[PDB]
Amino acid sequence: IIYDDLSKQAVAYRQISLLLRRPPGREAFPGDVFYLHSRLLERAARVNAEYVEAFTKGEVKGKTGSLTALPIIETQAGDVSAFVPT
Amino acid sequence: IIYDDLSKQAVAYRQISLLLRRPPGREAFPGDVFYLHSRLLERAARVNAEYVEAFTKGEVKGKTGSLTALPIIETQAGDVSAFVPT
Amino acid sequence: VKATGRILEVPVGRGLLGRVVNTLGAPIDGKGPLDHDGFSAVEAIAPGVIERQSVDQPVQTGYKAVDSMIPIGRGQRELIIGDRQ
Amino acid sequence: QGVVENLASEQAARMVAMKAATDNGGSLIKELQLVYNKARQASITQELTEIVSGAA
Amino acid sequence: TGKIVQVIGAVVDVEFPQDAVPRVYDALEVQNGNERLVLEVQQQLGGGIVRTIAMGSSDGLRRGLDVKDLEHPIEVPVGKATLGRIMNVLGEPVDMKGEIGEEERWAIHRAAPSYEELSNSQELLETGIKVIDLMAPFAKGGKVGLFGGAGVGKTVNMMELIRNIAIEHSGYSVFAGVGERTREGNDFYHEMTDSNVIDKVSLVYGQMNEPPGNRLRVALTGLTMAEKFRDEGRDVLLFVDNIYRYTLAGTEVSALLGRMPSAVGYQPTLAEEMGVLQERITSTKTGSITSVQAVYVPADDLTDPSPATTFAHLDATVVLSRQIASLGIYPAVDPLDSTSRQLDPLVVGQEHYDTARGVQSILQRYQELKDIIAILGMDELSEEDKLVVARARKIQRFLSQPFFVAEVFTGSPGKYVSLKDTIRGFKGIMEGEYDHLPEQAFYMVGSIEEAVEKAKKL
Amino acid sequence: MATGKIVQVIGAVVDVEFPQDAVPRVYDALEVQNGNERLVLEVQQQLGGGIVRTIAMGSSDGLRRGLDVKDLEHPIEVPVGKATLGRIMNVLGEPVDMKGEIGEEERWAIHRAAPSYEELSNSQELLETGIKVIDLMAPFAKGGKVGLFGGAGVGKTVNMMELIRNIAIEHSGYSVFAGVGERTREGNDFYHEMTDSNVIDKVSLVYGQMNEPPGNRLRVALTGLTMAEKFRDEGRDVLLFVDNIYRYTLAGTEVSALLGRMPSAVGYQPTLAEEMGVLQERITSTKTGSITSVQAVYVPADDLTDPSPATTFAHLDATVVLSRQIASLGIYPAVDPLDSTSRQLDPLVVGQEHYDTARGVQSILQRYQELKDIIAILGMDELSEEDKLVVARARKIQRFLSQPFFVAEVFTGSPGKYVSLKDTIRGFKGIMEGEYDHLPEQAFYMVGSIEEAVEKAKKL
Amino acid sequence: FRDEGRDVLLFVDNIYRYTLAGTEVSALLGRMPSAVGYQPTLAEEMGVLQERITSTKTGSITSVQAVYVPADDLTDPSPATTFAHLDATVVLSRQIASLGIYPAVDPLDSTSRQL
Ligand SMILES: Nc1ncnc2c1ncn2[C@@H]1O[C@H](COP(=O)(O)OP(=O)(O)OP(=O)(O)O)[C@@H](O)[C@H]1O
Ligand SMILES: Nc1ncnc2c1ncn2[C@@H]1O[C@H](COP(=O)(O)OP(=O)(O)O)[C@@H](O)[C@H]1O
Ligand SMILES: [Mg+2]
C-alpha cells in the first residue's frame, strides 16, 4: 500500500481538530497527530501462520500474510527536523 | 539561605494556578509570579539594632540581624529573554 | 470540612540545625522529633524602609573568582544563573 | 625574477581564496535565513496561541 | 449500578449514586458489546459523576450502558510467575501460553520510598562502549538516560547495553515496551528466547498501536513489577523502551479531562506526572534497580519542556545527536552534552577525570575554530590551532565503535573495549603520540592497537 | 414576504433569526433594506434555534436590530455569457461601470462542485501562447495553472494583454479578469489601457476593491470563476487572470477571524488548504472546453516556506519570472529563462526534440552566465576559441528570445508577430547547432521568426 | 508644587513597574490579553500618567525617569511607547557596560530634541 501524502492527511486532521476547538500544540497540530499516524502505519505487518490459520478458521494453512507500506512525506526546504517528519 | 531552584517553585505555582482556572499570562505563567518571587526575596534583609531590640522586647541590644539569600535559576540554552529569569 | 481559623505555621528554633525537614515541619531524617522554640507563620511581610540597615560586611564563598570579582555581603541577594549541569 | 614571479603567484592565490570565501559566505546566508524563517514562524505561532488560549 | 453519560474519545463520563461514588483511582468494568472494557477513575466531578480513562478501544460504546464498580485499583501479578512471559497493561498474559500462576497481585498506584529508606552507592559499572564509560560513566543503582531525536541509535545502543551489562549481572530484569514499534518487541522476544535468557527477563508491552489509557499506565505496571523483585533483596535491571510516550499519553488525555493547557501544549501536571513515575524507581537499602531509559526529544528540540524536566531526574544523561550521526560516527554520542554525577576524581580516579576533561577541552576549542574555518578555510589558522583541529578530528573518529548488535546494518565484527584501553588511547591521542597516523585509521576501530593495524593497510 | 429578523450586528457579522421550518441552507443569500439601499448577506453558519450567522456583502453601517430580512432560496447568482464581455462588475454581478444594465440571458450561482473524475479530458495538451520564451522554456498545459512571480516596472500588464489578444484571435476563446482586492486607481488605469489597446472587447472584468468588506474580496474570485465556467461550457479554452491570489488567502484569514474560528500555523485560517483547493480544483480541462489560469503570486517576507506560498506552489504547473535586469537590456518580454520553469517540460510530455532543445538552451545560457563573471574579473583574452564561440551563440540566443508585441507597435513601431511552437523550436535548434553563426546578433532582436531574422540580416 | 508656581524636580524610579503592576491585575479584571501578554490598555494607561508631567504657564515640572528594558531589547512595547513621550533619551547599553565603559551610554542611539 502507498499513501500519497501523510502530511496532507495530517493537515486535514488538523483542520478537523481546530474546528472542534481542541487546544493544539507544536506547530498548531493537535496532541494526537502522533497517534493518528501510529495506529495508521502499525497496521502494516507480517503475521505468522498461526494467526492466519486462526483468522481463516483453518481454511488457509501454513502461509504468512503481509502488508508492506511506503508512505510519502513532504518537507519544506529539505529539513528532516520538523514535527510531522520526525 | 539557599533556594536551590526558584524555577521549579514557579512551575509548581503555575500548575496550582492553572488547575484553579485562573487566567494565564506570558508562557502560561500567571501574572503574580513576579509577586511570588518579589515577596519571597524581599524578606531577605539586614535590620537595624532598633528593630532587633523592639522585636526581642529588650533582650538583645546592640546587634543587627541579617539574612543573605542565593536563589538559583536554570536557563534553557541560555535564553535570558524568558519570563521567569527576566 | 471544618475551617480552623489559623494560617499555616511552621516549627522554628535552634534545634532544627542539622535536621532534614519537610515543608510542614515533619522531620524526615528519622533522628527523632524536633526541639523548636515555638511556631512561626509561613506567610509574613518584610521589614520596612525605616527598619533596614546598609550592607558593609562580607561573607566568604571560599572560591576565588566569586569572592574577588563578585563579592557577597551580609544582607545581599545574589542570583546564581546558568544552564543545566 | 624569482621575487617578481612569487608576487604574481601571491595575487593569483589571493583571488582564488577570496572567491572561495565569497561562495562560503553565500552558503552561510542561505542557511541562516532558513533558521530565521523557522524562528519567526514558531515565535508568531507561540504568541498567537498564548493570546487565543488566554481569551478563555 | 452506574451508567455512562458521555463518551469523548479516550475519556468517559460515568454517573453513580450520590452515596456510592468510587475513589479517585478505582477501576470500573463495562461490557462493550460481547467484550469487556476496563475504565480507570481520574476525577470526581459534582453530583456523583466521575471522569474515567478507557483501558481499551472506545468505539462501540453507547451512552446509557451500565457499569460495575470494582472496589480496588488496577492490580497486576508480581513475582516469580511473571518472569518468562509477555504481559498487558492490566497484567493479563499476552503470549499465547496459559494463565500466570501468581501468588500475589499488587496495585500499580503506590508511593515512592521514604528519604530514610534510600541508599546511594558509588560502585562503578563497566560497559563495552568507549564513549559512554569514558565521558559519562554510570554506577550500579543509578538511572541512565539516552536522549536524542528520531533514528539516532537509542534502541540499538540500549540493546548493546543489555547485552554487555548482562555479562556482569546475575539476577532478574524487567523490560517495558512503552509506546514503540511492535516489530521491535517481537524481535527482542525472539532474540531473548533464542539465547535462553528469557527465563530471567520479564516483559511488559504496551505499544504505539494501543489507545492512550494502555500506554499511560503500562509504564507504571512495569515499574511495579520491578518493585516486587527489588523488595525480595535482589538487584534488578529495568529497561524502558521510551519514556516520552508516557507524557505524550498524558498530553493527549489532559485536554479532554478539562485541564487548561500549559506552555506549548503540555498538561499543567507534566512535572508532577513525571515526578510520580520516576521517583518510585530507585535503589533502597534492601534492593537496587539499575535502570536505562530512552528519552525521545521532539523535533530535535532539547529546550522542550518534556526533555527539559527529565534532565534533573537522571544520574547519567547521554545525548545522541543527528549531526554526529550524519557523519557516520556511530554511536552518535555528543560529548559536549553528555555528563554524569559520577565523573569526579574522588570516585572515578584522577587519570580518567583528566582524560575526560582534556577531551572536552579539545572538542570545545574545535567547535570554536569551526566558524572561522567555515568562512576562511583552514589556511588562516595558527599552527597550534591546526594541530588541535587534527587531534580533535582524530578524537571524534576514535569515539566510534562497531557494536555486535549492529553487525547487520554494517558488516564489521563487533568490539568490546575495556576502560583501561580507552583511557590509554585517548591519553595517547591527546599528548600527540599518534600524530603520524591518518584520520580514517581511527574510524570504527576498537582499541588503539587496531587503529595502528588499520593504518598499516590505510 | 420577508420571514426573518436581525438579532445581532457585530462589525461585519450579522445574525438573523427565522422560523424553524424556514432556516436557510449554508451558503444561501439574504437581502435587507438598509437605509434606502439593499444589502446582501451570505449565510456562513447555522447556529441552533433558527439563528444563522452571516457576513454582510457591503457596508454594515445603519443596520438596526429589528429589520426584516428576505430569504432568497439560491446562493449569490451572477450574469454569465457573452453579454458580460467589456463590462466591469462587482461581486454580486452588478455594473460598477456606468454603461448600463447587463442584458444577460442566464444567471449562475457562484458556488458549485468541481468537475467530476469522468469529466476530465482524456489526454494532456500544450497551449501555444505565440511568445517564444514561454512556448520554449515554460509551455502552458491546456487547463494548467501558471504563476507570475514578477514585480513592478516589468511588463506584467503588457504580457496579460498580449495573452488576451492571442487567445481571442489565434484561438477562439475569451478571458476573465478577477481583480481580487486591488487598488481602484490601478484598476481604472488597466481598464483604460485595455480600451486603448482594443482588447477590452474580448475580456470580462470583475473587480473587488480593497475598501470593500472581507467577504466581497473573498467571493469575487468565485464570481470570475463561474463566468469562466460558462465560457468553458460553450466549448472554448478560456484564460482566467487572478490579480493576486495572496489577497484571496488573506481575505479568507480575515473572514475566519471575524467568525471567530481558531487560527492555525503562522496565524492562518484552519481551512486554508480547503479554500485554496476549492478555488484551484475548478480550473481544469474538461472533455469539452478548458480554463487556463495565470495567477500573480506574492511571497510574504520573501519566505518560500511560508504557508501561503507553500500551499500555492502545490497547485502551480508552471512558473514565469519577470526580471528588471532583462528589461534593462531592452529585451521584451522581460522573462528570465533560468528561473522560469514548467513541469510540462519533459521529453515524454512535450516531445524529445523540444525537450532536448530546451535543455541545450538552458545549459548554454547558464554557462554564459558563469563566463560573464570570469570575463568581468579577468578579461576576454583568457578565453579559448571554443569558449568564445559559446559566448557568441549565447548572445545570439539571448537576443532571439525577444519578440515584438502588437501592443508594442505603439511603443516601438514594430508591427508585432506570432511565432508558432515548431517555428521557435526550429529557430533555437538552428542557433544551437551552428547554423546562422554568420549572422550578426542584432539580426535576432525583435525579429519574430528565424526566417525573418535572415531577412533582417539581408537588409543589414 | 507646580500650581503654587514653583519649579519642581520629579524623579521616578521605574515607569516599567507601573505598567507591570497594571499587567498583573489586568486579566483578573476580565480583560482580554494583548500582543505580548500586556493589558489591552497599555497605551492609554501610559498616556494618562505621562501627560500630567508637563510644564504649564503657572509652573514647571522637570522630570527624570529610569526605564527598564526587558531582555535588553528596545523592541518591547513598553520602552517603544515610552520613547515617544520624552524630550531627551539617554540609551544605556549592556554591551558597553560589559566592555567596562562607564556610563554605558550608546552615543549612536542617545539624542535630544534640544540638540
Ligand atoms: N552503530 C550503530 N548504532 C546505532 N544505529 C546504527 C548503527 N549503524 C547503523 N545504525 C542505524 O541507525 C538506526 C537508528 O537506530 P535506532 O532505531 O536505535 O534509533 P533511535 O534513536 O532509537 O530511533 P527511534 O526512536 O525512532 O526508534 C538503526 O536502525 C540502524 O539502521
Ligand atoms: N514590449 C514592450 N515594448 C515596449 N516597452 C515595454 C514593453 N514591455 C514593457 N515596456 C516598458 O516597461 C513598462 C512595463 O511596466 P508596466 O506594465 O507599466 O508596469 P505596471 O503594469 O506595474 O504599471 C511599460 O510601461 C513600458 O514603458
Ligand atoms: Mg530506535
Coordinates of all heavy atoms in Angstrom, one line a residue, chain F residues 355-382:
Chain F
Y355 N 12.2 18.9 -25.9 CA 12.8 18.8 -24.6 C 14.3 19.0 -24.6 O 14.9 19.7 -23.9 CB 12.5 17.4 -23.9 CG 13.3 17.2 -22.7 CD1 13.0 17.8 -21.5 CD2 14.4 16.3 -22.7 CE1 13.7 17.6 -20.3 CE2 15.1 16.1 -21.6 CZ 14.8 16.7 -20.4 OH 15.6 16.5 -19.3
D356 N 15.0 18.3 -25.6 CA 16.5 18.4 -25.6 C 16.9 19.8 -26.1 O 17.9 20.3 -25.7 CB 17.0 17.3 -26.5 CG 16.9 17.5 -28.0 OD1 17.4 18.5 -28.5 OD2 16.2 16.6 -28.7
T357 N 16.1 20.4 -27.0 CA 16.3 21.8 -27.3 C 16.3 22.7 -26.1 O 17.2 23.6 -25.9 CB 15.3 22.3 -28.4 OG1 15.3 21.3 -29.5 CG2 15.7 23.6 -28.9
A358 N 15.3 22.5 -25.3 CA 15.2 23.4 -24.1 C 16.3 23.1 -23.1 O 16.9 24.1 -22.6 CB 13.8 23.1 -23.4
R359 N 16.7 21.9 -22.9 CA 17.9 21.6 -22.1 C 19.1 22.2 -22.6 O 19.9 22.8 -21.9 CB 18.1 20.1 -22.0 CG 17.0 19.3 -21.3 CD 16.6 20.0 -20.0 NE 17.7 20.2 -19.1 CZ 17.9 21.3 -18.4 NH1 17.0 22.3 -18.3 NH2 19.1 21.5 -17.7
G360 N 19.3 22.2 -24.0 CA 20.5 22.8 -24.5 C 20.5 24.3 -24.3 O 21.5 24.9 -23.9
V361 N 19.4 25.0 -24.6 CA 19.3 26.4 -24.4 C 19.6 26.8 -23.0 O 20.4 27.7 -22.7 CB 17.9 26.9 -24.9 CG1 17.8 28.4 -24.5 CG2 17.8 26.7 -26.4
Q362 N 19.0 26.1 -22.0 CA 19.1 26.4 -20.6 C 20.6 26.3 -20.1 O 21.1 27.1 -19.5 CB 18.2 25.6 -19.8 CG 17.7 26.2 -18.4 CD 18.5 25.6 -17.3 OE1 19.0 24.5 -17.3 NE2 18.7 26.4 -16.2
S363 N 21.2 25.1 -20.5 CA 22.6 24.9 -20.1 C 23.5 25.9 -20.8 O 24.5 26.4 -20.1 CB 23.0 23.5 -20.5 OG 23.1 23.3 -21.9
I364 N 23.3 26.3 -22.0 CA 24.2 27.2 -22.7 C 24.1 28.6 -22.0 O 25.1 29.2 -21.8 CB 23.8 27.3 -24.2 CG1 24.2 26.0 -24.9 CG2 24.5 28.5 -24.8 CD1 25.6 25.9 -25.3
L365 N 22.9 29.0 -21.7 CA 22.7 30.3 -21.0 C 23.3 30.3 -19.6 O 23.9 31.3 -19.2 CB 21.2 30.7 -21.0 CG 20.7 31.1 -22.3 CD1 19.2 31.4 -22.2 CD2 21.4 32.4 -22.9
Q366 N 23.2 29.2 -18.9 CA 23.9 29.1 -17.6 C 25.4 29.2 -17.7 O 26.0 29.9 -17.0 CB 23.5 27.7 -17.0 CG 23.9 27.5 -15.6 CD 23.2 26.2 -15.0 OE1 22.2 25.8 -15.5 NE2 23.8 25.6 -14.0
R367 N 26.0 28.5 -18.7 CA 27.4 28.5 -18.9 C 27.8 30.0 -19.3 O 28.9 30.4 -18.9 CB 27.8 27.5 -20.0 CG 27.9 26.1 -19.5 CD 28.2 25.1 -20.5 NE 27.0 24.6 -21.2 CZ 27.0 23.8 -22.2 NH1 28.1 23.3 -22.8 NH2 25.8 23.4 -22.8
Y368 N 27.0 30.7 -20.1 CA 27.3 32.1 -20.4 C 27.3 32.9 -19.1 O 28.1 33.9 -19.0 CB 26.4 32.6 -21.5 CG 26.6 34.1 -21.8 CD1 27.9 34.6 -21.9 CD2 25.5 34.9 -22.2 CE1 28.1 35.9 -22.2 CE2 25.7 36.2 -22.5 CZ 27.0 36.7 -22.5 OH 27.2 38.0 -22.9
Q369 N 26.3 32.7 -18.3 CA 26.2 33.4 -17.0 C 27.4 33.2 -16.1 O 27.8 34.1 -15.3 CB 24.9 33.0 -16.2 CG 23.7 33.8 -16.7 CD 23.7 35.2 -16.3 OE1 24.5 35.6 -15.4 NE2 22.8 36.0 -16.9
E370 N 28.1 32.1 -16.2 CA 29.3 31.9 -15.5 C 30.5 32.6 -16.2 O 31.3 33.3 -15.5 CB 29.6 30.4 -15.3 CG 30.9 30.1 -14.4 CD 31.1 31.0 -13.2 OE1 30.1 31.6 -12.7 OE2 32.3 31.2 -12.8
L371 N 30.6 32.4 -17.5 CA 31.7 33.1 -18.3 C 31.6 34.6 -18.2 O 32.6 35.2 -18.3 CB 31.7 32.6 -19.7 CG 31.8 31.1 -19.9 CD1 31.8 30.8 -21.4 CD2 33.1 30.6 -19.3
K372 N 30.4 35.1 -17.9 CA 30.3 36.6 -17.8 C 31.0 37.1 -16.6 O 31.8 38.1 -16.6 CB 28.8 36.9 -17.8 CG 28.4 38.2 -17.1 CD 26.9 38.3 -16.8 CE 26.2 37.8 -18.0 NZ 26.4 38.6 -19.3
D373 N 30.9 36.4 -15.4 CA 31.7 36.7 -14.2 C 33.2 36.6 -14.5 O 33.9 37.5 -14.2 CB 31.3 35.8 -13.1 CG 32.1 36.0 -11.8 OD1 32.3 37.2 -11.4 OD2 32.6 35.0 -11.3
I374 N 33.6 35.5 -15.2 CA 35.0 35.4 -15.4 C 35.5 36.5 -16.3 O 36.6 37.1 -16.1 CB 35.3 34.0 -16.0 CG1 35.6 32.9 -14.9 CG2 36.5 34.0 -16.9 CD1 34.6 32.9 -13.8
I375 N 34.8 36.8 -17.4 CA 35.2 37.9 -18.3 C 35.3 39.2 -17.6 O 36.2 40.0 -17.9 CB 34.2 37.9 -19.5 CG1 34.4 36.7 -20.4 CG2 34.5 39.2 -20.3 CD1 33.3 36.5 -21.4
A376 N 34.4 39.5 -16.7 CA 34.4 40.7 -16.0 C 35.7 40.8 -15.1 O 36.4 41.8 -15.0 CB 33.2 40.9 -15.1
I377 N 36.0 39.6 -14.4 CA 37.1 39.7 -13.5 C 38.5 39.6 -14.2 O 39.4 40.4 -13.8 CB 37.0 38.5 -12.5 CG1 36.2 39.0 -11.2 CG2 38.3 37.9 -12.1 CD1 34.9 39.6 -11.4
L378 N 38.7 38.7 -15.1 CA 40.0 38.6 -15.8 C 40.0 39.4 -17.1 O 40.8 40.3 -17.3 CB 40.3 37.2 -16.0 CG 40.7 36.3 -14.8 CD1 40.5 34.9 -15.0 CD2 42.1 36.7 -14.3
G379 N 39.2 39.0 -18.1 CA 39.2 39.6 -19.4 C 39.0 38.6 -20.5 O 39.2 37.4 -20.3
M380 N 38.6 39.0 -21.7 CA 38.3 38.2 -22.8 C 39.6 37.5 -23.5 O 39.4 36.6 -24.3 CB 37.5 39.0 -23.9 CG 36.9 38.2 -25.0 SD 35.5 39.0 -25.8 CE 34.3 38.7 -24.5
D381 N 40.8 38.0 -23.1 CA 42.0 37.4 -23.6 C 42.2 36.0 -23.1 O 42.9 35.2 -23.7 CB 43.2 38.2 -23.3 CG 43.3 38.5 -21.8 OD1 42.3 38.4 -21.1 OD2 44.5 38.7 -21.3
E382 N 41.6 35.6 -21.9 CA 41.8 34.3 -21.3 C 41.0 33.2 -22.1 O 41.4 32.1 -22.0 CB 41.3 34.4 -19.9 CG 41.9 33.3 -18.9 CD 41.2 32.0 -19.1 OE1 40.0 31.9 -19.4 OE2 41.9 31.0 -18.9

